[PDB]
Amino acid sequence: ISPAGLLTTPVLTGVGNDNRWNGQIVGLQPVPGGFSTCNRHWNLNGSTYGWSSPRFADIDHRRGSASYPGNNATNVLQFWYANAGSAIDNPISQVAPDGFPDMSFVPFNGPGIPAAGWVGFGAIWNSNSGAPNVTTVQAYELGFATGAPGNLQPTTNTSGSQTVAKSIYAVVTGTAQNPAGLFVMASGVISTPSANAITYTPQPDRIVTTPGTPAAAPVGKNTPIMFASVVRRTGDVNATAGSANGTQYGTGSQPLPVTIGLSLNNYSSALMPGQFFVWQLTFASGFMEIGLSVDGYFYAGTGASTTLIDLTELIDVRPVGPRPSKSTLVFNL
Amino acid sequence: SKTVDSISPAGLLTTPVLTGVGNDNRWNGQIVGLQPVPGGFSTCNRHWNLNGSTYGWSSPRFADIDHRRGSASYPGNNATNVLQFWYANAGSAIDNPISQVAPDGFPDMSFVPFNGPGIPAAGWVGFGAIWNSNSGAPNVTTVQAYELGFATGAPGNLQPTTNTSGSQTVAKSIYAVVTGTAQNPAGLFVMASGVISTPSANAITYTPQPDRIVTTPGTPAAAPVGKNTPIMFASVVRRTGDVNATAGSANGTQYGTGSQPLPVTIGLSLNNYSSALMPGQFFVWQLTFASGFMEIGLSVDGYFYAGTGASTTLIDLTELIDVRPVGPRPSKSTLVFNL
Letter for the amino acid at B61? Answer: R
Nearest CA to A299 out of A281, A285, A272, A318 is that of A281
> Which of B46, B82, B127 is the best mutation test for A, with the most CBs of A within 10 A?
B127
Distance CA B325, CA B12 (A): 10
Contact status, residue B16 vs residue B321, Cβ threshold 8 Å: no
Nearest CA to A118 out of A241, A234, A239 is that of A234
Distance CA A263, CA A279 (A): 20
Distance CA A250, CA B119 (A): 36
Which residue does chain A place closest to B265, by CA atoms?
Answer: A15
**Resolution in A, one decimal?**
1.9
Nearest CA to B258 out of B54, B106, B45, B18 is that of B45
List CB contacts (< 8 A) between B193 and chain A: 56, 185, 187
**Alpha-carbon distance values, A11 to A157, A312, B17, B48 (Å):** 31, 13, 17, 19
Distance CA B321, CA B309 (A): 24
Nearest CA to B47 out of B235, B331, B308, B300 is that of B300
Q: What is the DSSP-derived secondary structure letter of residue A244?
A: T
Q: Flag whether residue B64 sits within 8 Å of chain A, measured between CB atoms.
A: yes
Instruction: Using DSSP, state whether A326 is helix, strand or coil.
Output: coil
Distance CA A295, CA A45 (A): 8
Give the number of residues written for chain B: 339
Contact status, residue B45 vs residue B208, Cβ threshold 8 Å: no
Parallel, antiparallel or unpaired: strands A275-283 and A286-292: antiparallel
Q: What is the DSSP-derived secondary structure letter of residue A80?
A: E
Contact status, residue A145 vs residue A157, Cβ threshold 8 Å: no
What is the 3-class SS of A193-225, one letter each residue? Answer: CCCCCCCCECCHHHECECCCCCEECCECCEEEE
CA distance to partner chain A, nearest, from residue B131 (Å): 8
Parallel, antiparallel or unpaired: strands B124-131 and B159-160: unpaired
Q: What was the elucidation method?
A: X-ray
What element of type H or E holds A228? strand A223-230
Contact status, residue A113 vs residue A105, Cβ threshold 8 Å: no
Closest CB from B62, B175, B178 relative to A75 = B178
CA distance to partner chain B, nearest, from residue A121 (Å): 6
- Tally the C-alpha atoms within 13 A of residue B3's C-alpha that lie toward its C-beta: 0
Q: What is the DSSP-derived secondary structure letter of residue A177?
A: -
> Which of B143, B177, B253, B268 is the best mutation test for A, with the most CBs of A within 10 A?
B143
Parallel, antiparallel or unpaired: strands B229-236 and B31-36: antiparallel
Contact status, residue B201 vs residue A130, Cβ threshold 8 Å: yes
Backbone angles phi, psi at B320, to 5 degrees: -70, 130
Instruction: Using DSSP, state whether A321 is helix, strand or coil.
Output: strand
Q: What is the DSSP-derived secondary structure letter of residue A328?
A: P
Q: Which residues contact B218 (CB under 8 A, 6 or more apart)?
A: B55
Q: Which residues contact B24 (CB under 8 A, 6 or more apart)?
A: B31, B233, B234, B235, B256, B257, B258, B260, B261, B262
Give how far the C-alpha of residue B125 lies from the chain's centroid of Cα atoms, to the nearest Å: 12
Instruction: Using DSSP, state whether A258 is helix, strand or coil.
Output: helix
Q: Which residues contact B130 (CB under 8 A, 6 or more apart)?
A: B72, B84, B86, B138, B139, B142, B181, B183, B186, B187, B188, B189
Q: What is the DSSP-derived secondary structure letter of residue A11?
A: H
CA distance to partner chain A, nearest, from residue B143 (Å): 6
Distance CA A266, CA A268 (A): 6
Contact status, residue A105 vs residue A80, Cβ threshold 8 Å: no
Burial of A205: CB neighbours in 10 Å, binned 0-12, 13-18, 19+: exposed
Letter for the amino acid at B6? Answer: S
Letter for the amino acid at A293? Answer: S
- Tally the C-alpha atoms within 13 A of residue B162's C-alpha that lie toward its C-beta: 11
Backbone angles phi, psi at A306, to 5 degrees: -110, 5
Distance CA A12, CA A281 (A): 9
What element of type H or E holds A140? strand A138-146
Nearest CA to A119 out of A92, A107, A101, A146 is that of A101
Distance CA A247, CA A201 (A): 12
Parallel, antiparallel or unpaired: strands B304-306 and B229-236: antiparallel
What is the 3-class SS of chain B, one letter each residue? Answer: CCCCCCCCHHHHCCHHHHCCCCEECCCCCEEEEEEECCCCEECCCCCCCCCCCCCCCCCCCCCEEEEEEEEEECCCCCCECCCCEEEEECCCCCCCCCCCCCCCCCCCEECCCCCCCCCCCCCEEEEEEEECCCCCCECHHHCEEEEEEEEECCCCCCEECCECCCCEEEEEECCCCCECCCCCCEEEEEECCCEECCCCCCCCCCECCHHHECECCCCCEECCECCEEEEEEEEECCECCECCCCCCCCCCCCEEEECCEHHHHHHHHHCCCCCCCCCCEEEEEEEEECCEEEEEEECCCCCEEECCCCCCCCEECCCEEEEEEEEEEECCCCCCEEC
Distance CA A149, CA A163 (A): 11
Q: Flag whether residue A260 sits within 8 Å of chain B, measured between CB atoms.
A: yes
Please spell the DSSP secondary structure of A270-302, one letter per residue: S--TTEEEEEEEEETTEEEEEEE-TTS-EEES-
CA distance to partner chain B, nearest, from residue A326 (Å): 36
Using omega within 30 degrees of 0 as the cis cutoff, is the peptide bond preceding B328 cis?
no
Contact status, residue B203 vs residue B245, Cβ threshold 8 Å: yes
What residue spans of A121-280 are helical by DSSP H?
256-264
Nearest CA to B148 out of B173, B178, B167 is that of B173
Nearest CA to B74 out of B144, B125, B127, B126 is that of B144
Give how far the C-alpha of residue B291 lies from the chain's centroid of Cα atoms, to the nearest Å: 31
Q: What is the DSSP-derived secondary structure letter of residue A329?
A: P
Q: Flag whether residue A238 sits within 8 Å of chain B, measured between CB atoms.
A: yes
**Alpha-carbon distance values, B190 to A130, A141, B100, B103, B130 (Å):** 23, 17, 18, 11, 9
Interface of A with B in 284-313 (CB under 8 A): none
List CB contacts (< 8 A) between A169 and chain B: 140-141, 143, 178
Distance CA A314, CA A283 (A): 4
Could you tell me which residues are beta bridge partners of residue A144? A104, A163
Instruction: Using DSSP, state whether A79 is helix, strand or coil.
Output: strand
Backbone angles phi, psi at B229, to 5 degrees: -120, 135
Distance CA B322, CA B309 (A): 23
- Taking the alpha carbons of B55, B59, B62, B63 in that order, is the dihedral positive or negative? negative
Instruction: Using DSSP, state whether A312 is helix, strand or coil.
Output: coil
Nearest CA to B126 out of B103, B100, B107 is that of B107
Contact status, residue A201 vs residue A116, Cβ threshold 8 Å: yes
Contact status, residue A169 vs residue A79, Cβ threshold 8 Å: no
Distance CA A306, CA A27 (A): 12
Interface A–B counts its CB contacts (< 8 A) at 112
Interchain contact, B270 vs A125, CB within 8 Å: no
Q: Flag whether residue B191 sits within 8 Å of chain A, measured between CB atoms.
A: yes
Backbone angles phi, psi at B281, to 5 degrees: -115, 155
Q: Which residues contact B188 (CB under 8 A, 6 or more apart)?
A: B65, B66, B67, B70, B86, B88, B103, B128, B130, B131, B171
Closest CB from A55, A132, A238 relative to B243 = A132
Distance CA B84, CA B74 (A): 5
Could you tell me which residues are beta bridge partners of residue B190? B65, B128
Contact status, residue A225 vs residue A173, Cβ threshold 8 Å: no
CA distance to partner chain B, nearest, from residue A169 (Å): 6
Burial of A138: CB neighbours in 10 Å, binned 0-12, 13-18, 19+: buried
**Alpha-carbon distance values, B152 to B65, B111, B156, B157 (Å):** 20, 9, 9, 8
